[PDB]
Design a protein around this ligand. Structure first.
Ligand SMILES: CC[As+](CC)(CC)CC
Ligand SMILES: [Co+2]
Ligand SMILES: [Tl+]
Ligand SMILES: [Tl+]
Ligand SMILES: [Tl+]
Ligand SMILES: [Tl+]
Lengths: 103, 106, 103, 103, 103, 106
């Protein structure tokens, strides 16, 4: 083990769960709002990933309050996750560089 | 809400000819159109989904095409068992809406 | 305490303030510009979050000079904040890894 | 050498490959889907970069399942890569700061 | 001084230059392409920032080859810059945490 | 600026019948339409907001529907106290605009 790598794993699992519950809850929240486009499950999972990577194109987006809530949670999950890998990569690199220098 | 427009309301064709039913959207809906069949006294019967994906259990002569706002269900060689009403349905934006329907007649 | 975690907290509070003043000022700046879409408070707060996470979909965006100024401030707040957590996560991981190694 | 810089290089090479295979496979997956816009090679490479930087504008995006798969791979490649540079930059800075302090 | 903070400064200056030359060159490249929307200076600077923060909404985007080149340069400048601050923030935090621990 | 089009300008209905007022946008505005009522000599009176959300204090027989460019205010069982002018208003894009109005008449 090692904490940093253990958090990355955790964060991935978590992410995969967040952006599934995400899809489900997005559809659940968005159906009922006239004109809402984010209303079938499959494409709504693709919206989840898209959103979590902050690449948001605008083919799909939530229009209701709770959709947008779910949205916000997905975004932060996406960022937190991906940042917590970058952090974990530095931790690793920094550990190694100290060996190269004999520290 | 999305308005689906099936014209013409009736379609008269000679047996075997190729036939084409039209369905038009009030605004671009991609390929989120779906086709149902209703024979006299019967329940609707999913024929084609997302405009062109075929459904297992439906004659090979059934097909479909289109994208955006203009969509078409076709039958290659028509025949007696095809006499029915044909509705299209969209799942692009919420409410979910049907077409007025068109009747095939041989 | 610990500085890194204290900055993260700070940055969150700050962010929440930036993307509220953001919404308010966005509406204030955008009303008056014909065709501007970013002109009610609630949706304009959703624009704030969206923007700060860099996920910008394009359901809403500022069209005036000052809207876009406010926009720029929100973006940088969003990024700074989220980066300052990633930094804080590495700081943490790096602190820990040194214990595992008995350093 | 030095690991951190060696990973950055690696990650760049990898990225350049991912967002070429990306373009190719995107076109391959998207042609055949009526209304698909992501269907010529040149612009589809521009879609690749756009996507990998998470800047996704929405001039172009995948509509099929496999397009979106390819998409997901490009995004993660883009992020992983760019994060693995930030990590490598900290590793470097952190190495240096310790010299300034005579550690 | 301190390297990490000196690079952040540098990167900011650089960024400000990249996303000005960016605007200028974007307009220069895009005028002449029928239907191109990215063709006046002011809004094209707003496109620059938008793009560099990866928030790309899709109110504006390059359509030509060289526009898209310029685009790519702006994106990478934006990311590099903002990552090089996050790196610099960790470097700082990590320096400090070691004092708290008396290292 | 957004142009709201209320047709027909007058609506003649028998007591109790279901009635429907139309309002059309020059361009898609989502659901940012709002309905007001003005009785002779009276001030406007918010009836429905965002096309379908009801307002506390308004008869249950008032409802609304639509999205994008085509919107509808309805009254289930009409009656004397409904005789008024009916305006719709959009808050999608700036200026903020009203419909020409339509008059209900029993
Ligand atoms: C303004 C972004 As778009 C409409 C949501 C993305 C499809 C048009 C480029
Ligand atoms: Co030491
Ligand atoms: Tl982004
Ligand atoms: Tl984005
Ligand atoms: Tl977008
Ligand atoms: Tl980032």
């Amino acid at each position: 083990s090692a904490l940093h790598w253990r958090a990355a794993g955790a964060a991935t699992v978590l992410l995969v769960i967040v952006l599934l519950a995400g899809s489900y809850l997005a559809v659940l929240a968005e159906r009922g709002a006239p004109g809402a486009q984010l209303i079938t499950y499959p494409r709504a999972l693709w919206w989840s990933v898209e959103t979590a990577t902050t690449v948001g194109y605008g083919d799909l987006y939530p229009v209701t309050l709770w959709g947008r809530c779910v949205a916000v949670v997905v975004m932060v999950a996406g960022i937190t996750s991906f940042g917590l890998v970058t952090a974990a990569l530095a931790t690793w690199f920094v550990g190694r560089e100290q060996e190269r220098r004999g520290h | 809400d999305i308005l689906l427009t099936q014209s013409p309301a009736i379609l008269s064709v000679s047996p075997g000819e190729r036939v084409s039913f039209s369905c038009r959207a009030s605004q671009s809906i991609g390929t989120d159109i779906h086709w149902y069949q209703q024979r006299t006294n019967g329940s609707p019967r999913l024929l084609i989904k997302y405009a062109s994906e075929s459904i297992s259990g439906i004659p090979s002569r059934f097909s479909g095409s289109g994208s955006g706002t203009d969509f078409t269900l076709s039958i290659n060689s028509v025949e007696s068992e095809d006499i029915a009403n044909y509705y299209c349905q969209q799942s692009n934006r919420w409410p979910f809406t049907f077409g007025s329907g068109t009747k095939l007649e041989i």
